[PDB]
Each structure stands twice: as structure tokens, then as C-alpha cells.
Design a binder for this molecule. Structure first.
Ligand code: ADP
Ligand code: ADP
Ligand code: ADP
Lengths: 195, 244, 278, 316, 58, 231, 107
């Protein structure tokens, strides 16, 4: 709703008086089904999803991470609508300091480069952004904030239901004599993630 | 400040430079380690307790897994947190009630039981040799004049009366739900209370329970003896929820 | 020959059609600050005769900081909207390039262009990317920045007192900023952007809910009473959040829950602390 | 006791009027279960509140005036001290909020003014003063306030009460201005500006503190520009607030435009939502006088001196 | 002070409220003293200019 | 099996400070604010009893507690510790009454309580209490208002404030309050100085007030607090 | 080396061995006179009209420094600048007092 609709069914969004969503960030225990969501989204939606593992963006050439980000939003800015999907932001995710190595300064800027684009003056249009992380405890205050990230999307460890629900999905392609102990497996299976 | 530490203020129960007690906070964290959630709702003429009954294995006598305890024939409690600590605190509560009746010649009020237990845990908070208990007790019972009562005590020494409360993993969410559903002002009958509590837990966990996945304690004005509902009557309450 | 006023800065005057748009309207409940910038640039920039005669000494650069969402980037959009001079939007994250001199070459440009345009607003969103004090000459990356600072520094005070060019720098972490920046001359007026309170919120709420329609019975008052301390920005996640809930079920205009959800959807910071500590 | 009230309230809340209901209201006070009437009197007050505005719906607040002494003794034998402050503040207030004889107000006010002392909670004694000084200004007698306020200057400062000091400075300043003294009155307004800055503001009060300055900026003719900036804001206040005084400032806000010779900004002032919410004799006037000017005609202005003087005659 | 037989001084201290006029007394004298008046704080900018980093404050 | 740590946890720093005491005071200056005014014919204590929700029953725990029939208490800081001190103060009061068959003087109860607080800065194995107490009393015609801090030191006040923003509250009291005040006016200025911080619509269940005149100490009913909160 | 900080109680001991900070001089807060003087110096910068009693201003002042006063003056001008008036009467200053003592009372 936040992401797909505000594109093919935003023409009436203004009829409520609300700009399309801004950004969405998964954030959950390692294995809650985050990385599998970006895949499912770009597979179904299909439009212009550009995935950035937020790691291979870093180089070493002064502002080599500023140009990558500029081109990312530029390409997209022109090419929009486009989905921006960043895998693990904890990299550029950062948090700032006071301070750290002369290296950290590079990331920050770079960490800021995006922040200034997501908001700043020129107003993102059509092009939307999915933020990815495991552990959101690390992120900069100035990033989580609306105008940058709209609403955070939590993905908790599947319930006994969610387990069972997911359990019959991965074990569905297995040769199993009329003895499938789904209610037993799921039961003992607690705190167990999706993988 | 804002997270500052000095000396042993994160190991024993002494003051941090910003005036915190870190071991107590850690005890609160220890409550959630059980991975359970309990809901307590006070009615016009009753009090209801409800709790997940996680019996992960059929190799366990499912009758011996209970977080509901009889403190007195007319005072019930539900424990949330570290199991063995919970039982310790239950024994202490039992003793304090019995002793109260023996010295004062009337039945202990939940208010004073909770206050007593709390008072005991504050000592753990203030003495260095021992560590707080990683548990949380919620007491219910009918007082002679104040009507139905639900109280709750913490690992630090805090205790309070409630219209409705919860403890454990989904505490904040259950409080949000309940504080939404209390403002609506409805005739809090018995079934209204039971349904409210059960649905609070159910929606908070998104489960829709079997009658063997939860346990429901109760106390009424018409029947003040703390009664633990059989699986049958629980189910009777369950099927009535898939009607409206 | 002497190339007339040119070069990157990097764009050049924004143009006109690229207006920040955000009209003074949207930006509400910010008199002091609002007035402050107005008092810092808008007015001082225009009426110069009372700055010299009335013995006022106008300021050269203005610093904007505070929490992240209290509304500084809006303040620049508003100024570039009503404005009249030449609003240069140069990001401090662009100055450092893959070249050994590009940075100064720009500053000499933006500053060069500023002189040429007219009473122009140079605006630097997030000067952190340039000025972060704790420099380190050796990494061969710091060297480039420091100078960029020195560049900013040199052309920062090099003007003439007459050069009608104001400097507007926005940053939340108003801390990792070499004091060399905040010195009477380079960055005089220092302005703060609080995370609203009660009244302000009312203006922020009323202004946010004034863009849509909504149930006229309801009263975003209940919410304003609360503390939470929601920033001017977050209050926006709610207004938008309500639409998602009101639109997800199809229905022009919102409901109680639409805000309730928003309040529970935005605030988030439910717990926080403990009840014994007080 | 309770038998009547709620049922009577349920009867009252229905329709008819307080006056019929007064037979119950008066009876509420007159009755019934002789609780004390403790809570009843509070609810009898609930009438005497309504019943007061119902008293006003007829003019017995003069009745209740004398009874106000009795009600005192009546809460005195049932209503605690505090209970009086609230009960004794719902009569002197709701009574002043209505247009009637100055005396009965002054008479009663003065009464209860002196009552606070005989009881002795200087806190209310000062609060009631604001009304006593304000009423002495509108009523007629000016020299009266002069002494009252000049005695009240240290009555709020001792505690540093801040908004009451401004009120007396604002409110009292007006008395001086009318007494034909813009120097002193002016000086009084200036003093308030400095005092008002020390503390919060807050809203309405701040509007008087503005408009009033707009007034002084037009009392001696000192650029209708500096005054206009007070009228505009001071209009904004009453606008997004009680909206009772806002209707007043719109007038002066337009005055500056009429003098400045800009009927364009007057067109700007007449736009529906902003004020037009008032459409009446306040806008029609200044509009007709404005474009009447643009025509640079005198015949026209003369006729707008004629037909719309119903307000113009009532001004200072 | 040499003529009196007393080791002249080198170091001074100024202590009080913050913002009453201490730097001035250090600047004004220094100004009125025709002596280079230096302001050594801890800015990395300053070290890169004056001192090529070196390793201390000598 | 168990004994007790026998060594002091509160020890002198090289500067000569008892660091744990100042950190305990830091815990006090983080609790809900409380104001106390001695007013010629009586004493007023008030405090912010602000909950976290609508679920907590505010008619169940109180912060303004009676010690005897003529002495009352409020606190700033940690709750449980306050509870302990209140029990102990009631006990001390009753010891005194057994022995002298005369209700304990407010100064003496303050002394005794303070001694208890000082013990936990010198006995072994413990932290100091994280509580400041305001103790009001009526004895010998005059009214009495004392404060005791975690060090075990006590001071007599005409008026004072503790907890969050206690400095601004204190200044406000220094200005907007003076002698010859009747208890009613004192209640007024107390709720007034509490409002200088209460972030909320100060209701009749958001604050707790107690009085102490020469008719005994008592807690003001929610009704009475509503009446007083109606200005 | 002039090393001029605040609260001598902050500086270490090794920096106090009686001989090592030749002349230890201390700054006093600024009273009516000093302020008055300071007040006259800063107000001299801007265009100040007649009928301006500065003393009255420092009297209202209570706990300011060498910088604070500067803020007051500036605002006085700042206030007059907004009033569209080149000069700066006494009233203005009397406001700035608060406006600064607003800040003086603020953070
Ligand atoms: N809800 C789920 N349904 C099916 N498979 C899942 C689910 N969650 C996790 N998995 C398994 O784990 C993988 C997804 O891991 P992922 O969510 O990317 O972890 P992380 O969040 O640490 O990146 C999938 O390839 C799948 O095999
Ligand atoms: N009083 C207000 N009026 C209008 N918008 C506001 C107000 N307060 C907050 N906002 C909203 O919050 C956002 C503020 O963004 P901004 O302050 O630029 O963040 P940053 O400091 O990270 O650039 C804007 O989108 C603005 O609409
Ligand atoms: N005695 C004084 N007379 C006039 N101005 C002063 C005085 N003391 C300080 N100031 C003002 O303070 C500013 C410099 O403050 P300074 O004293 O250097 O800071 P600090 O208080 O940290 O020493 C100057 O602009 C000056 O106007």
C-alpha cells in the first residue's frame, strides 16, 4: 500500500490530502524475511528497482561514494518511477561521531549525501526507497525521521502460526509418508526464525 | 551522563552517576526471558487472569505447567519471568498471607500482600549480596469493601493497583489494546471481562487459542474463592467469541 | 583574459522554475525562528540603510541547527520561495570531489557567482560534510577538506562588509563544527530549532490537518495535550499515516483510529523508562 | 434533593427556560433532602450558574447579588473555603460577563472584594481587583482606577504575578489615555511591553498589548505603518481565538490603509474566510469609506459619515 | 625586575565568570604591547598551518 | 546460605566527596517534583502523582503519607525506598509515643528518620536511599517543615521544592511566596509552583496534596483538589 | 602564556604549585558601574538618542557579564530596526533587558 499503490492509485491520494509514502525500512532479527521481501517486491512490481547493498558503494576516492549516490538518484530521478532498495545500510547507515578515524568522515558525508537527496531541496518524485537492516539500534537520528523514512516495517520471528504457515512452504517439496508431524515440528519449534 | 557508568554500578545494586540502578533494569530484562505474556482485567463484579500455556512437548505433564498460583483460597496470582524465582516469590507470598491471618485474625487484603512482597524485593534492590528476582507478580482478589482488585509488583519494589494490566513479552501492546478498550465504557460483566482479556492476549499474539494453550484464573464477588477454569469452560468461552 | 563570473557552484541561481515551492504557508508555528531568519537575512538583506545608519551591523552567515526534523530545510525552501535574490543551493557533500582543487575552485565560484548575481543567499545544507573540526592531515582525504574549510574560511571573511551575500548553513549535529566557523564575522547569528512542544504543535497539527479535509467534530487537541515531544517532522508522519489507514479502507478523510493508529504508528517510543525511578 | 435536580435538569436540559426551571433552580437552593446541601448546593450552583445566566435571562443577578452574600453563608455552613472561590467566582464573573447596572456589579464586587479580606486569601482579592479596575474604566469614573491600580501595582509585583501586572498596566494605561494623557498612558504601555516580554505572553492579553500600541501609534499621528503591524497581528489573535475582539481590530487595520491611501489593501482585507466570517456593519463601513475615498469624493464620504455613524458616533 | 633582583615572570591566569572580558585583557595588552598575541587552542586546522603536525606543542 | 557484605559501599573520594551520596541525590533530582510550604497557620505538601496510562488506579497508591496524626510526608526520588522510610518513620513515632505518651515532635521524627538514612551510608553492603523527604508537622502551636536528604542531613524550610526542576520551583517560591499566608493561599501557591513543571492538564488525580494545620495532618480528597484546581 | 579560564577549582593542582602562575588575577562580576561603563561603551557603537539613562538599565540588570550587555544593546537596536526607526530611545533598551534576561533565564 505504501509503495505500489501510491503510483498506480495515487491519482486519488490527493483526494485525501496526503503525499505518497516516502520510505520503508525493514528491521528485524537476522532471518525474519527481509532480504526475501526486496526480491519478492522487485519480482512482482517490476518497474525500476535498483538494489544497493550499501557496501559496494564505498570506494576510497575522496567523494567516490558521493558520485555513486548522485547517479543512483539522478538516474532514478530522471528514470523515476524507480524503487531503491538498499541491502544493509548499517554501512553508510552509520551514526556519526565526535569522533573517529579520518575514514568515518568519508562515509558520513556519503551517509549524508543520501539524506540530503531524500529530502533537502529537490523533492524526490515517483522514485521510492526501501531501507534494509538487521539491527536498527545503530542508525543516525537524522535518517529514521519522516521526510526520509516514513514508517518502519517490523518482521518478527514467525508465530507458531507463522512457523507452521512457513513450515508447510519450505517443506512442501519433500517426500513424506503419511506421517507429516507438522503440528509436532512447529510446536517444539519456538523462537525459530524463517530459515 | 545519559548512560554513564562508574565503578561497579553495573554489577551490583548501587547508584550510577546519573542515579540509575542498572542491576534492577537488568532484572526487568530478565522477566522477558520466559517468553510468555499474561493479561489481567478487573470487572464490575469480578477479576480475570489469562496466560499463555506453552507446553512445547507432549513428554510433559501439562497439568504441572501453570503460572497461576493459589496464595490464599481467595487470592490468586500470576507470575511472569524467571520460573524458579516466581515460585520463590509465591512461597513467600503464601507465608505472608498465612502469617497475616494468624497475627491479625482476618484475611489478608491483596493490597497489603502486594505491598509486603514489594517491600521484600526492595531489600534485594538495596543490599549488595543478593540479586533481585527476575519475576513479576499480579494478584487478584475481592476485597470486603473496595470491590474487585488487581495489583502488581515489580523486581525493584514497585507495586500498584490497576483496572487492567499485563506482563511479559507483549506488555506494551497489551497495555495499548486495553487502554483503548477501557475508554469505551461498557458494562463490565463477567463474560465481558473474560472475553476482553482473552481477545487482548489473542490479538496481541495473533493466535486464536486452543483451549489447551491458555489458562484462565478468576475471582468473583458472588464466588470469591479463586477458581481456575477447566479446559472445557475455557473452550466454552472460546466458541462464544466466534459468534460476534 | 579574465573569465567573467562563471564556473560551477555548482548549478547557478536555481533559475526560477525550480523554486523550493514550500510556501510560507506550510511552514507555520515558527515566528521567532521564522522572524529570526527574516531578521537575519530577508530583512537585513533587503533594507540595508537601517543596518548601517541604525548602527546594527548585519550578520554575514547564519547557522541553523537543532534536532532532526524541527524544520530547517523547510526554512530554506520558504526563503527560496518568497525570496528575491539569488538562492545558491550548494551541498557541503559535493565540495569534495575526485580532484585536488575542485573544492576551492567551487567556493571561489559560488562566492564569485554570489558577488555577480546580487544580494544572493548562499545556502549550505549540512556543512558537516565540509567542516568537522577533528581533521587529520595525512590520510590525504582530510587535506582536501581542511582547505575547503580554509576556502570557506578565506572567502568567508574576505568580502567587504558591503557584499550583500548571506551564508545559511543547516546542521543538526551542531557540535563537530570547528569553532573557526562560528566566529563573529563568518557565522554570527546562531539559531536553534527545538522539537516543538504544545502550542507549536497546535500550529503544526492545525497546519498539517489543514491540507486535507477531515471530520470537523474531532479535535487534534487530545493529542496536543500529550508530551511525547514529537518533532515538527514526525507530526507529518502522522498526517500522512492517517491517509494510508483512511485510504487503505477507501474513505476520503480520516477517523479517530486513523489518528490513533498514526499516534501509535508514529510515536512508537511507547515504553522508554521505568516507574520506580520516580 | 437529588430527586428534583437531575430530573429537573433532565427537565431543564429539555427545553422551556431557566425561569420555569428556576422554580426548580430556586428550589434547588430551597431544597430538598437537606444533604447540606453539600453536593446539592454545588448542583444548586449548577443552576445558579445556569440559573445565574437564567437570572441574567431576566435580571435577578440582582436578586442573586444580595443572595451572593447569603450563598456565601450558605457555602459557609456547607461549602468549604475553596468551594467558595469557585462558587464565588462563578457569580462575580458570569455576572460581569453580562450587560447590566454598574452599581450592582460595583456594589456586589466591592462587597465580595472586601469579602476576600474578611476571609483572607489575597490570591482572589487581587484577581477580583482586575475586574474592579476594569469596570471603573468602562463605567465612567476614571480617577477611581487611577488610585485603585496605583495601589495594585505592588499587590501583584510582590509575588511577581506576571500577567495581572500587565493587565493593570494594559487596562490601567487605557484609563490614562482616555483621561487625555498620551504621554503618561503611552509611558504605561511602554512599561507593559517590557514587563510582558519578561514572561510568556500569552495570547489575548498580548493582543491588547499590541492593538493598544497600534492605538498609541495613531493617537499622536506617528506613521500608520508602525501601528498597522500591531493591528494586523492583534487581529490575528482574536481571529484564531475567541473571535470577540477581532471584530474590533479589523476596523483599525483598515483605518491605516484608508489613511495610507491604499484601497487595494482594503480589497485585500475584504476576503470571505479571513474575516467576512463577520460580514456586518464593521466591514461594509470601512469598505464604502475606502472606495468612497478612491473616488476622491466628499459627497460620498459625507453620506458614509451619515448612515454608518451608528458605530462611528460610538468611538474615542 | 632585573634591577630589583627578581626572576621576571612568564605565566598568568585569569579566572572568573564566562563572558565578562578576559580575552580582551589578553588581547588589549597584547595589542597595546606590540607583541604577537597567539591563540593556541586545539584546532587541527591550526596545526596543519603553523605546525606540520610534528607530534607535540613545542 | 547468606550473611551480609560488611564493608562500606559509600567511601571518600580523594577530593573528599562521598560519591554514592551525590549519585543518590542524582536519583532524587530525577523524580517527580514536590513542593512544601509552611504558612503561619499550616503546612502544605503537594506532589505530581502522574501515572503512565489510564490503567493504573490512582486511588490505590499514595505519595502523601501520614506518619502519625500530626505529621505528614512526601518524597522525591525512588518509590520503594520511600515506602521503607515511611514504615520506619511510623515505627519510630510509635516508639516515642510508647515511651513518652505524647505524640512525637516533628523535629524529633525528622532527626530519627535522618539517622536511619545516615546508617545506610556507613553500614555495610548497602546503597544510600534515593529519596529526599519533606516532612510537615504541627507541634506546640507552630507549624514545621523539614527536608531530609540521602546523606542523612536535614534542614528546616519555610518553603522548598524537590525533584525535577527544583531550582526554578525554588526561585518561584522565593518570589511568589511570603509569610502571613493562610493555608488556603499556601495551597494555592503550591499548586501554582507545581504547575510550573506539570506537563499535562493538571487534573485532580494527577497531583496529590496534603495539609497540616492545628487540627491534624490529612490528605486532601480528590474533590477538594478539584475545587482548588478550579483556579 | 596567558592561560585564562574559569572556576580555578577546575584547573589541576600541578598548575598551582605556588610559584608557577606568576600573578593570579581574578575577574569580578559586572555590577551597575562596570556594566554602566560597559553599557556606555557598547551603546556608544550604535546610534543612541537622548533621554537615555543607562544606569536605570543596569539596575534592572542583575547577573550579566561583559557579553550579556552587548546582547541587550544589540537587541535595543534590533528592536528599533524592526520598528522602522533609525534612533533608539530608552524604551527599546528596557525591552532588550527582558529579551536578553529572557535568554539569561533561557538555557
Ligand atoms: N517467511 C519466510 N518464508 C520462507 N522462507 C524464509 C522466510 N524467512 C526466511 N526464510 C529463509 O531465509 C531466507 C531469507 O533470509 P533473509 O530474510 O534475507 O535474512 P536477513 O533478514 O538476515 O537478510 C530465504 O531464502 C528463506 O530460505
Ligand atoms: N511548523 C511547521 N510547519 C510546517 N512544516 C513543519 C513544521 N514543523 C515540522 N514540519 C515538517 O517537518 C519537516 C522538517 O524538515 P527539516 O526541518 O528540513 O529536516 P532537516 O533538518 O533534517 O532538513 C518538513 O517536511 C515540514 O513539513
Ligand atoms: N569589561 C568589559 N567591557 C566591555 N565589554 C566586555 C567586557 N568584558 C567582556 N566584554 C564583551 O565580551 C566579548 C568577549 O568576551 P570574552 O570576555 O572574550 O569571553 P570570556 O568571558 O570567555 O572571556 C567582547 O565582545 C566584549 O564586548
Amino acid at each position: 500500500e505504501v509503495i505500489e499503490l501510491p503510483l498506480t492509485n495515487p491519482e486519488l491520494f490527493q483526494r485525501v490530502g496526503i503525499i505518497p509514502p516516502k520510505g520503508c525500512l525493514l528491521y528485524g532479527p537476522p532471518g525474519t524475511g527481509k532480504t526475501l521481501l526486496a526480491r519478492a517486491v522487485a519480482s512482482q512490481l517490476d518497474c525500476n528497482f535498483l538494489k544497493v547493498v550499501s557496501s559496494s558503494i564505498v570506494d576510497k576516492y575522496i567523494g567516490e561514494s558521493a558520485r555513486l549516490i548522485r547517479e543512483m538518484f539522478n538516474y532514478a530521478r530522471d528514470h523515476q518511477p524507480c524503487i531503491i532498495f538498499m541491502d544493509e545500510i548499517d554501512a553508510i547507515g552509520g551514526r556519526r561521531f565526535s569522533e573517529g578515524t579520518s575514514a568515518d568522515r568519508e562515509i558520513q558525508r556519503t551517509l549524508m549525501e543520501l539524506l540530503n537527496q531524500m529530502d533537502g531541496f529537490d523533492t524526490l518524485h515517483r522514485v521510492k526507497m526501501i531501507m534494509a537492516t538487521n539491527r536498527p539500534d545503530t542508525l543516525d537520528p537524522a535518517l529514521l525521521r519522516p521526510g526520509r523514512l516514513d514508517r518502519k516495517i517490523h518482521i518478527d520471528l514467525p508465530n507458531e502460526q507463522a512457523r507452521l504457515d512457513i513450515l508447510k512452504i519450505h517443506a512442501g517439496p519433500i517426500t513424506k509418508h503419511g506421517e507429516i508431524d507438522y503440528e509436532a515440528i512447529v510446536k517444539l519449534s519456538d523462537g525459530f526464525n524463517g530459515a | 551522563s545519559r548512560g554513564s557508568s562508574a565503578g561497579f554500578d553495573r554489577h551490583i545494586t548501587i547508584f550510577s552517576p546519573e542515579g540509575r540502578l542498572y542491576q534492577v533494569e537488568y532484572a526487568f530484562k530478565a522477566i522477558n526471558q520466559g517468553g510468555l505474556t499474561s493479561v489481567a482485567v478487573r470487572g464490575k463484579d469480578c477479576a480475570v487472569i489469562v496466560t499463555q500455556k506453552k507446553v512445547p512437548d507432549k513428554l510433559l505433564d501439562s497439568s504441572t505447567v501453570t503460572h497461576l498460583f493459589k496464595i490464599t483460597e481467595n487470592i490468586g496470582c500470576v507470575m511472569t519471568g524467571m520460573t524458579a524465582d516466581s515460585r520463590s516469590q509465591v512461597q513467600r507470598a503464601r507465608y505472608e498471607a498465612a502469617n497475616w491471618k494468624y497475627k491479625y485474625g482476618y484475611e489478608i487484603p491483596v493490597d497489603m500482600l502486594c505491598k509486603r512482597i514489594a517491600d521484600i524485593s526492595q531489600v534485594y534492590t538495596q543490599n549488595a549480596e543478593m540479586r533481585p528476582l527476575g519475576c513479576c507478580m499480579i494478584l487478584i482478589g475481592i476485597d470486603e469493601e473496595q470491590g474487585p482488585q488487581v495489583y502488581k509488583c515489580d523486581p525493584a519494589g514497585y507495586y500498584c493497583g490497576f483496572k487492567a494490566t499485563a506482563a511479559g513479552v507483549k506488555q506494551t501492546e497489551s497495555t495499548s489494546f486495553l487502554e483503548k478498550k477501557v475508554k469505551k465504557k461498557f458494562d463490565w460483566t463477567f463474560e465481558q471481562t473474560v472475553e476482553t482479556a482473552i481477545t487482548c492476549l489473542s490479538t496481541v499474539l495473533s493466535i486464536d487459542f486452543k483451549p489447551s494453550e491458555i489458562e484462565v484464573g478468576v475471582v468473583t464477588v458472588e464466588n470469591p474463592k479463586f477458581r481456575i477454569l477447566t479446559e472445557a469452560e475455557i473452550d466454552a468461552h472460546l466458541v462464544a467469541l466466534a459468534e460476534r | 583574459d579574465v573569465l567573467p563570473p562563471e564556473a560551477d557552484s555548482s548549478i547557478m541561481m536555481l533559475t526560477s522554475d525550480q523554486k523550493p515551492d514550500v510556501m510560507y504557508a506550510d511552514i507555520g508555528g515558527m515566528d521567532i525562528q521564522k522572524q529570526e531568519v527574516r531578521e537575519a537575512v530577508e530583512l537585513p538583506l533587503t533594507h540595508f540603510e537601517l543596518y548601517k545608519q541604525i548602527g546594527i551591523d548585519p550578520p554575514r552567515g547564519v547557522l541553523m541547527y537543532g534536532p532532526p526534523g524541527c524544520g530547517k530545510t523547510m526554512l530554506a525552501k520558504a526563503v527560496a520561495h518568497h525570496t528575491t535574490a539569488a538562492f545558491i543551493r550548494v551541498v557541503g557533500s559535493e565540495f569534495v570531489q575526485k580532484y585536488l582543487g575542485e573544492g576551492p575552485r567551487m567556493v571561489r565560484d559560488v562566492f564569485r557567482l554570489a558577488k555577480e548575481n546580487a544580494p544572493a543567499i548562499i545556502f549550505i545544507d549540512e556543512i558537516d560534510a565540509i567542516a568537522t573540526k577533528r581533521f587529520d592531515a595525512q590520510t590525504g582525504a582530510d587535506r582536501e577538506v581542511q582547505r575547503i574549510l580554509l576556502e570557506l574560511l578565506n572567502q568567508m571573511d574576505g568580502f567587504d562588509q558591503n557584499v550583500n551575500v548571506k551564508v545559511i548553513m543547516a546542521t543538526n549535529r551542531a557540535d563537530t563544527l570547528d569553532p573557526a566557523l562560528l566566529r563573529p564575522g563568518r557565522l554570527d547569528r546562531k539559531i536553534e530549532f527545538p522539537l516543538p512542544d504544545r502550542r507549536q504543535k497546535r500550529l503544526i497539527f492545525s497546519t498539517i490537518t489543514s491540507k486535507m479535509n477531515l471530520s470537523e467534530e474531532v479535535d487534534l487537541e487530545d493529542y496536543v495535550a500529550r508530551p511525547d515531544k514529537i518533532s515538527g517532522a514526525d507530526i507529518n508522519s502522522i498526517c500522512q499515516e492517517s491517509g494510508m489507514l483512511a485510504v487503505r479502507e477507501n474513505r476520503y478523510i480520516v477517523l479517530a483510529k486513523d489518528f490513533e493508529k498514526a499516534y501509535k504508528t508514529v510515536i512508537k517510543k511507547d515504553e522508554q523508562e521505568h516507574e520506580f525511578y520516580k | 434533593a437529588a430527586a428534583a435536580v437531575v430530573e429537573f435538569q433532565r427537565a431543564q436540559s429539555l427545553l422551556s427556560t431557566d425561569r420555569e426551571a428556576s422554580i426548580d433552580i430556586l428550589h434547588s437552593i430551597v431544597k430538598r433532602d437537606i444533604q447540606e446541601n453539600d453536593e446539592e448546593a454545588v448542583q444548586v450552583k449548577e443552576q445558579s450558574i445556569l440559573e445565574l445566566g437564567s437570572l441574567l435571562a431576566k435580571t435577578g443577578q440582582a436578586a442573586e447579588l444580595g443572595g451572593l452574600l447569603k450563598y456565601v453563608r450558605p457555602f459557609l455552613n456547607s461549602i468549604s473555603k475553596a468551594k467558595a472561590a469557585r462558587l464565588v467566582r462563578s457569580l462575580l464573573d458570569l455576572f460581569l460577563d453580562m450587560e447590566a447596572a454598574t452599581g450592582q456589579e460595583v456594589e456586589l464586587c466591592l462587597e465580595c472584594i472586601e469579602w476576600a479580606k474578611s476571609e483572607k486569601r489575597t490570591f482572589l482579592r487581587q484577581a477580583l481587583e482586575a475586574r474592579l479596575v476594569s469596570l471603573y474604566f468602562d463605567t465612567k469614573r476614571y480617577q477611581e482606577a487611577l488610585h485603585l491600580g496605583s495601589q495594585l501595582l505592588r499587590e501583584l509585583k510582590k509575588m511577581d504575578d506576571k500577567a495581572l501586572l500587565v493587565e493593570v498596566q494594559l487596562l490601567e494605561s487605557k484609563t490614562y489615555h482616555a483621561l487625555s494623557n498620551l504621554p503618561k498612558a503611552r509611558a504605561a504601555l511602554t512599561s507593559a511591553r517590557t514587563t510582558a516580554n519578561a514572561i510568556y505572553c500569552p495570547p489575548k492579553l498580548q493582543a491588547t498589548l499590541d492593538m493598544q500600541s497600534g492605538i498609541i501609534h495613531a493617537a499622536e499621528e506617528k506613521d500608520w505603518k508602525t501601528a498597522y503591524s500591531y493591528f494586523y497581528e492583534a487581529f490575528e489573535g482574536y481571529d484564531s481565538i475567541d473571535s470577540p475582539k477581532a471584530i474590533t481590530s479589523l476596523k483599525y487595520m483598515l483605518l491605516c490603509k484608508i489613511m495610507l491611501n491604499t484601497p487595494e489593501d482594503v480589497q485585500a482585507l475584504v476576503s470571505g474566510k479571513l474575516a467576512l466570517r463577520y460580514a456586518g456593519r464593521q466591514t461594509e463601513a470601512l469598505k464604502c469609506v475606502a472606495q468612497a475615498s478612491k473616488n476622491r469624493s466628499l459627497a460620498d464620504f459625507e453620506k458614509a459619515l451619515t448612515d454608518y455613524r451608528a458605530e462611528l458616533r460610538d468611538d474615542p | 625586575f632585573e634591577a630589583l633582583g627578581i626572576a621576571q615572570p612568564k605565566g598568568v591566569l585569569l579566572y572568573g565568570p564566562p563572558g565578562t572580558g578576559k580575552t580582551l585583557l589578553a588581547r588589549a595588552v597584547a595589542h597595546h604591547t606590540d607583541c604577537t598575541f597567539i591563540r593556541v587552542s586545539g584546532s587541527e586546522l591550526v596545526q596543519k598551518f603553523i605546525g606540520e603536525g610534528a607530534r607535540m606543542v613545542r | 546460605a547468606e550473611r551480609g557484605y560488611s564493608f562500606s559501599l559509600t567511601t571518600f573520594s580523594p577530593s573528599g566527596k562521598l560519591v554514592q551520596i551525590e549519585y543518590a541525590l542524582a536519583a532524587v533530582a530525577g523524580g517527580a517534583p514536590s513542593v512544601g510550604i509552611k504558612a503561619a497557620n499550616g503546612v502544605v505538601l503537594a506532589t505530581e502523582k502522574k501515572q503512565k496510562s489510564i490503567l493504573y488506579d490512582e486511588r490505590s497508591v499514595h505519595k502523601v503519607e501520614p506518619i502519625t496524626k500530626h505529621i505528614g510526608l512526601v518524597y522525591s526520588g525512588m518509590g520503594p525506598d520511600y515506602r521503607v522510610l515511611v514504615h520506619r518513620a511510623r515505627k519510630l513515632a510509635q516508639q516515642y509515643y510508647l515511651v513518652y505518651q505524647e505524640p512525637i515532635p516533628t523535629a524529633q521524627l525528622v532527626q530519627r528518620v535522618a539517622s536511619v538514612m545516615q546508617e545506610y551510608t556507613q553500614s555495610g553492603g548497602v546503597r544510600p536511599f534515593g529519596v529526599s523527604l519533606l516532612i510537615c508537622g504541627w507541634n506546640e502551636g507552630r507549624p514545621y517543615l523539614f527536608q531530609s536528604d540521602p546523606s542523612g542531613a536535614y534542614f528546616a524550610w519555610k518553603a522548598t521544592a524537590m525533584g525535577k526542576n527544583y531550582v526554578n520551583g525554588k526561585t518561584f517560591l522565593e518570589k511568589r511566596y511570603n509569610e502571613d499566608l493562610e493555608l488556603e493561599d499556601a495551597i494555592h501557591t503550591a499548586i501554582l509552583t507545581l504547575k510550573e513543571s506539570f506537563e499535562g492538564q493538571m487534573t485532580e488525580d494527577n497531583i496529590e496534596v496534603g495539609i497540616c494545620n492545628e487540627a491534624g495532618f490529612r490528605r486532601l480528597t480528590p474533590t477538594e483538589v478539584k475545587d482548588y484546581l478550579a483556579a | 602564556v596567558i592561560m585564562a579560564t574559569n572556576r580555578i577549582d577546575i584547573l589541576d593542582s600541578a598548575l598551582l604549585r605556588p610559584g608557577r602562575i606568576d600573578r593570579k588575577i581574578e575577574f569580578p562580576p559586572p555590577n551597575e558601574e562596570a556594566r554602566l561603563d560597559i553599557l556606555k561603551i557598547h551603546s556608544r557603537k550604535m546610534n543612541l538618542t537622548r533621554g537615555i539613562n543607562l544606569r536605570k538599565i543596569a539596575e534592572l540588570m542583575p547577573g550579566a557579564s561583559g557579553a550579556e550587555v552587548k546582547g541587550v544593546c544589540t537587541e535595543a537596536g534590533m528592536y528599533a530596526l524592526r520598528e522602522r526607526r533609525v534612533h533608539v530611545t530608552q524604551e527599546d533598551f528596557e525591552m532588550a533587558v527582558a529579551k536578553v534576561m529572557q535568554k539569561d533565564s533561557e538555557k
